[PDB]
Amino acid sequence: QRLPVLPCHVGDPDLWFADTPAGLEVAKTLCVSCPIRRQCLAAALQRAEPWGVWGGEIFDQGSIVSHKRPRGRPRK
DNA sequence: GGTCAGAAAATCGGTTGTGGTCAGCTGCTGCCACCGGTTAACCTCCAATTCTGCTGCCAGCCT
Ligand code: SF4
């Protein structure tokens, strides 16, 4: 079916929870071409997923952050 | 025009705090399900054929 075209499970699944701001960036933008962004993002927002890339967007424990804040002192 | 204390990020983890929450009985209380005993005019005996082997039976020579 359309399973190998689905960009979620094409490669290694441990990529999409890597705890670097730059590592998961290609994981987030790899769901640009995903055919099911609407329903996946809708399910992720309704069930309140606390981790990882969902619907081509990252998640905190309840909501969506724009980009994950890096380790260290943030920029003034 | 470079080194050292403080501030500010998640991050892994302990506290903690209470706010319900669900169950675990626990009486307990009513009830309900189930088992056992009892009834004192009289009237006291049932509703097909084919083949093989076994046993019961009667005349009848033999002693
Ligand atoms: S997170 Fe995005 S890319 Fe991954 S399966 Fe869901 S919609 Fe597709």
From Swiss-Prot:
GO terms for biological process: cell redox homeostasis; negative regulation of DNA-templated transcription; response to antibiotic; response to fatty acid. GO terms for molecular function: 4 iron, 4 sulfur cluster binding; dinitrosyl-iron complex binding; DNA binding; metal ion binding; protein-disulfide reductase [NAD(P)H] activity. Disruption phenotype: Decreased resistance to macrolides, a lincosamide, and an aminoglycoside antibiotic. Keywords: 4Fe-4S, Antibiotic resistance, Cytoplasm, Disulfide bond, DNA-binding, Iron, Iron-sulfur, Metal-binding, Transcription, Transcription regulation. It comes from the Bacteria. Its main location: cytoplasm. Induction: By sublethal doses of antibiotics such as erythromycin, streptomycin and tetracycline as well as the fatty acids palmitic and oleic acid (in clinical strain 1254). By the antibiotic erythromycin. Positively regulates its own expression (in strain H37Rv). The Fe-S cluster can be nitrosylated by nitric oxide (NO). [4Fe-4S] cluster binds at residues 8, 31, 34, 40. One of its GO terms (cellular component) is cytoplasm. Its cofactor is [4Fe-4S] cluster. Residues 7-64 form the 4Fe-4S Wbl-type domain. Binds 1 [4Fe-4S] cluster per subunit. Contains 1 [2Fe-2S] cluster after reconstitution of overexpressed protein from E.coli. Following nitrosylation of the [4Fe-4S] cluster binds 1 [4Fe-8(NO)] cluster per subunit. It is found in: Cytoplasm. Residues 68-76 bind DNA. The apo- but not holo-form probably binds DNA. Acts as a transcriptional regulator. Probably redox-responsive. Upon overproduction at least 10 other genes are up-regulated, among them are Rv1258c, Rv1988, Rv2301, Rv2416c, Rv2725c and whiB7 itself. Probably redox-responsive. The apo-form has been shown to act as a protein disulfide reductase. Belongs to the WhiB family. This is Probable transcriptional regulator WhiB7. It comes from Mycobacterium tuberculosis (strain ATCC 25618 / H37Rv).
